[PDB]
């Protein structure tokens, strides 16, 4: 297994790689809930802002919130039957 992420680590890497980092760790995180499009949702989510995300990591009360919000935004427009 690998260790979690921290503001100290996100700083070491550039602002262009940070996004990949957060998303990379978020991939498996959300993969336990919505693996169907974990990456997709992880893209827009992590794209929101590293400032907020940094706090979201230790915020299990807001994380699930954003996740569900996005998942719902899909059905709103259109829902497909893709395995």
């Amino acid at each position: 297994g690998q260790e979690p992420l921290t503001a100290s680590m996100l700083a070491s890497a550039p602002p262009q790689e940070q996004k990949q980092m957060l998303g990379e760790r978020l991939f498996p995180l959300i993969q336990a809930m919505h693996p169907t499009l974990a990456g997709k949702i992880t893209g827009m989510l992590l794209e929101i802002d590293n400032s907020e995300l940094l706090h979201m990591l230790e915020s299990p009360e807001s994380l699930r919130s954003k996740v569900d919000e996005a998942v719902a935004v899909l059905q709103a427009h259109q829902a497909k039957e893709a395995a």
């Binding site: 997709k40 893209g43 827009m44 929101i48 719902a72 935004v73 427009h77």
Partner: peptide
């Protein structure tokens, strides 16, 4: 009432690799 209203049209975060349809 969707205080964030995300963009479902958004694109994945992973790096785009493997050209072509396959």
């Amino acid at each position: 009432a969707k205080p964030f209203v995300p963009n479902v049209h958004a694109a994945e975060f992973v790096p785009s690799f493997l050209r072509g349809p396959a």
